[PDB]
Design a protein around this nucleic acid. Structure first.
Lengths: 301, 41, 98, 346, 106
DNA sequence: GTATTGACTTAAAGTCTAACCTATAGGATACTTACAGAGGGACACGGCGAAT
RNA sequence: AGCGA
DNA sequence: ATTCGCCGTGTCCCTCTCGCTCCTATAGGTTAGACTTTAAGTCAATAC
């Protein structure tokens, strides 16, 4: 047998309960609405309300539990509608079961927000609610990257237009062609193509691509020691100059803590004015541009 | 986690839920990876 | 594949309104041809380092392929030279590798 | 750095369920064929029993069953009386006119056959009642129950006396209520005194039982409540030059589990029927089993191009596991190669 | 054929010489669990924080600025009341009440 | 060389408005069961026969 | 996917 | 019919190395974009 198919097991499961008709649906809807109002009234009467008479409390609690019963009965009734609807979409989505469950969520929404006084079979409203929920969940859970609904819709419209034009014309149209067809810009079309891209799988057969994936962002393995020696040389050169000049440069360019101190802060910490320090900075940088202080640093670019 | 060549035993063992949620640094609860537009997690 | 699509829409499409232009789909046919010529272990890259190699890569017989025996199943049994090869398949030339 | 996912419903680990020999099967003394039906929500399991309460409400409910079967016999002798009146009507309408000797009694045979099949109906339903009563009398804990209708009747008429549940949480409850020490000593007695298949099975099981007893290992970890998540650089999405992203094929599985867990959480918050909730728990189970070893139980979860996905188990199994690809050799820095020539003057 | 990550090499090795002076804050969870998170001198401690466990945790020092609940979720009660009326639902309740009455005691 | 004051332009924020993405809810005729489309050694789950 | 020892 | 001893069949992990080339409607968040302010950097002259 090898009965490990949850699909067939679930179908066999949902085949147990019988399908219903319009008057039965009206009865169930009335029962659920009455049960909900009963629970609401009992909560209201439990808080600063009234000591519910034993018999009244009893039969209204019965009404509540029976409303829940009817809700569940209806959901069991229309599971088959869910599967029948879900069949069309499968082929471009996830596990069938996921779509079925989204359909069930749409059903509980529909049975929550159904009205019987309009005198209609429940099937249509159920259908629309189901489809809305399925499409929403499919979109939210389609790709490893998330693409919100309106952009999903324009992507689908672009795809349908391109496919029908391929069927009719026979050639793949152009970005300007799709821009004029969809009343949008060619750059927008290009962006929709770009965001339409789906990730490739690191796992493949060729071997796996993961083998040949150079780590362009990684240890350079030479610039590390290069920067170490660089810093050593800068400390040396700064020691060659005056200590005040060296400290001023270190604070100006953040060589001591990584925090770049500016003219007002350095003038404050040296007890002088920012123009004084600007003169200091200009003279020191002019001193540094003199090649004897720069022959040992020129090669570091 | 981080040590030196001090090694005498490699003990495998069946893990427990307290051990798992003590291992972890947070509770992932959303099925998303990267923002499609800015390419940030 | 084309035929399955055609017969599928051959019912859904309304009658007295359709034509082979609206019925036929050439996308899967062109895709099949392209997927054969590219990325198939018989649509081999032309091995032309000398004119003789250009000739000999053609006329080449390969027993491994789709609908064929890969080296996993292509054991020694099929690698010998049955006496029927005389005049039909050279016994000498064959790659020295696996 | 790792993550974890808190599961709204405990889920059984796959290795200790499916890999033959089944470790849960040997720990709980359950057949794998019947344990699959439990952890995949195909059958219920009784995880407790109160023999005293059953023992006295046995008298009370046997009186109730006598009442029920006497009502059944009230219906049955109602059938007898009604068909007897109809049969005397057949008398008055077949032996009171001019008719054929056999055609006047074809209605006789019709009514008698109606009573025969009607008492067949009554007998078969009474036999069903006797069967269910006998099942209740001989019910025990740690026991399997198929026939959802039978289980539903059993619970809603005997909701006490036991905790009958379905799935991973029921297995958790069984492991909770399980003295390893007395059971191990019982297996020790069985291997002390027994013979043949019984002793052989005792050895096979005592293996894992004593394995768990000797260590400080609780068997609670066999069923799972928080599933860890591997650090992201080990399942990276590296972009290729051109925006073609490259996921690691574990992100889709971790998604599947996250989406199904959140769907379960919302369903339980909202209030959903038993069918939907149990189905959701089954999908959560399947998602976790696929995450840990895809292709082990049932159809392997495919990807685009009908390619099976690479779960965690597949990262170690076979020739392409870590135990080989980076342990059968590594590329090394400060290396080179070249063709060689003979160096006779060296 | 190559790839990169949105990361910073920041070739700086390590510095234990100067660490931006920092105290440590603590936000106990709802189940007697404490998960310390360090915070700088210039750090503006939150009233409550997403702790290491995952659930929301409040600072040990007693502040309690206002949990400030958000809009109730759309309850089936909500979508029923926004399209029906109290008197009509009450009439329905009486209908089913008398229904079960007449069913029970006749 | 070192430390100042008074224009004179400049980058870095701060803000206001805003404008443009983005997440969410709903759509009320009828609409009721997925799909399928090698070989070898070894062990464990199970045929065939004598005994009580 | 193809190829050399 | 169960026991114990044989056979028999079905399901599963493993096998050289190295290289090369569908739509609508709301409400809220985000960023963006430009106008305005301010600390900031510069230049010219100067006195000691």
């Amino acid at each position: 047998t090898a009965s490990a198919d949850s699909v067939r097991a679930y179908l066999k499961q949902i085949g147990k309960v019988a399908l219903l008709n319009a008057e039965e649906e009206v009865e169930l809807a009335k029962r659920i609405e009455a049960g909900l109002y009963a629970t609401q009234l009992m909560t209201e009467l439990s808080e600063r309300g009234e000591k519910l008479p034993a018999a009244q409390r009893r039969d209204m609690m019965w009404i509540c539990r029976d409303g829940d019963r009817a809700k569940n009965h209806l959901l069991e009734a229309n599971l088959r509608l869910v599967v029948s609807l879900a069949k069309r979409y499968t082929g471009r989505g996830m596990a069938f079961l996921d779509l079925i469950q989204e359909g069930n969520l749409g059903l509980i929404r529909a049975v929550e927000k159904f009205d019987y006084t309009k005198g209609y079979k429940f099937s249509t409203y159920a259908t629309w609610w189901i489809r809305q929920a399925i499409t929403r969940a499919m979109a939210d859970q389609a790709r490893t990257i998330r693409i919100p609904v309106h952009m999903v819709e324009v992507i689908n419209k672009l795809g349908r237009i391109q496919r029908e034009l391929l069927q009719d014309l026979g050639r793949e149209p152009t970005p300007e062609e799709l821009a004029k067809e969809m009343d949008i810009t060619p750059e927008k079309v290009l962006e929709i193509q770009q965001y339409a891209r789906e990730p490739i799988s690191l796992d493949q057969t060729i071997s796996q691509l993961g083998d040949f994936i150079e780590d362009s962002e990684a240890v350079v393995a030479v610039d590390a020691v290069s920067f170490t020696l660089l810093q050593d040389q800068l400390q040396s050169v700064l020691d060659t100059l005056s200590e005040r000049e060296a400290g001023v440069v270190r604070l100006r360019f953040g060589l001591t803590d990584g925090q770049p101190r500016t003219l007002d802060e350095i003038g404050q910490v040296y007890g002088v004015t920012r123009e004084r320090i600007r003169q200091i900075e200009s003279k020191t940088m002019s001193k540094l541009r003199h090649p004897s202080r720069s022959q040992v640093l020129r090669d570091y670019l | 986690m981080l040590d030196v060549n001090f090694f005498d035993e490699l003990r495998i063992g069946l893990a427990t839920a307290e051990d798992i949620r003590q291992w972890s640094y947070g509770e992932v609860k959303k099925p998303e990876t990267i923002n499609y537009r800015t390419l940030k997690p | 594949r084309m035929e399955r699509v055609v017969r599928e829409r051959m019912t859904t499409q309304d009658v007295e309104a359709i034509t082979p232009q609206t019925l036929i789909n050439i996308r899967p046919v062109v895709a099949a041809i392209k997927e054969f010529f590219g990325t198939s272990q018989l649509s081999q890259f032309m091995d032309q380092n000398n004119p003789l190699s250009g000739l000999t890569h053609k006329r080449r017989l390969s027993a491994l392929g789709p609908g064929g025996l890969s080296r996993e199943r292509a054991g020694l049994e099929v690698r010998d030279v049955h006496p029927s090869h005389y005049g039909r398949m050279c016994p000498i030339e064959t790659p020295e590798g696996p | 750095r790792m993550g974890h996912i808190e599961l709204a419903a405990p889920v059984t680990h796959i290795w200790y369920f499916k890999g033959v020999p089944s470790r849960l099967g040997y720990l709980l003394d359950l057949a794998p064929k019947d344990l699959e039906k439990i952890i995949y929500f195909a059958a219920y399991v009784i995880t407790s029993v109160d023999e005293e309460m059953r023992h006295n409400e046995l008298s009370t409910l046997e009186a109730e069953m006598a009442v029920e079967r006497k009502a059944v016999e009230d219906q049955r002798d109602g059938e007898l009386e009604a068909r007897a009146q109809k049969l005397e009507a057949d008398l008055a309408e077949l032996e009171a006119e001019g008719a054929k000797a056999d055609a006047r009694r074809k209605v006789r045979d019709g009514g008698e056959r109606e009573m025969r099949q009607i008492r067949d109906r009554a007998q078969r339903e009474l036999d069903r009642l006797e069967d269910i009563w006998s099942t209740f009398t001989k019910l025990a804990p740690k026991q399997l129950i198929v026939d959802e209708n039978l289980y539903r009747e059993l619970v809603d008429r005997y909701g006490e006396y036991f905790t009958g549940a379905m799935g991973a949480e029921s297995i958790q409850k069984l492991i909770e209520n399980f003295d390893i020490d007395a059971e191990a000593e019982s297996l020790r007695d069985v291997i002390r005194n027994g013979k043949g298949q019984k002793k052989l099975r005792a050895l096979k099981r005592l293996k894992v039982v004593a394995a768990f007893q000797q260590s400080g290992n609780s068997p609670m970890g066999m069923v799972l409540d928080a599933v860890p998540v591997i650090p992201p650089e080990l399942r990276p999405m590296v972009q290729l030059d051109g925006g073609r992203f490259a996921t690691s094929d574990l992100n889709d599985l971790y998604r599947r589990v996250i989406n199904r867990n959140n769907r379960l959480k919302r369903l339980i918050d909202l209030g959903a029927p038993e069918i939907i909730v149990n189905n959701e728990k089954r999908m959560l189970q399947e998602s976790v089993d696929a995450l840990f070893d895809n292709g082990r139980r049932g159809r392997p979860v495919t990807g685009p191009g009908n390619r099976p996905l690479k779960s965690l188990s597949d990262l170690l199994k076979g020739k392409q596991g870590r135990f080989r690809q980076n342990l059968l050799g590594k590329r090394v820095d400060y290396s080179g190669r070249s063709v060689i020539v003979v160096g006779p003057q060296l | 054929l190559r790839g990169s990550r949105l990361g910073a090499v920041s070739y700086e090795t390590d510095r234990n010489h100067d660490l931006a002076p920092r105290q440590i804050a603590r936000y106990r969870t709802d189940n007697g669990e404490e998960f310390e998170v360090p915070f700088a001198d210039d750090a503006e401690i939150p009233g409550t924080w997403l702790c290491r466990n995952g659930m929301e945790g409040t600072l040990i020092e007693g502040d309690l600025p206002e949990p400030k609940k958000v809009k109730p979720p759309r309850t089936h009660w909500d979508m029923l009341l926004e399209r029906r009326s109290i008197e009509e639902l009450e009439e329905l309740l009486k209908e089913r009440l008398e229904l079960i009455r007449s069913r029970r005691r006749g």
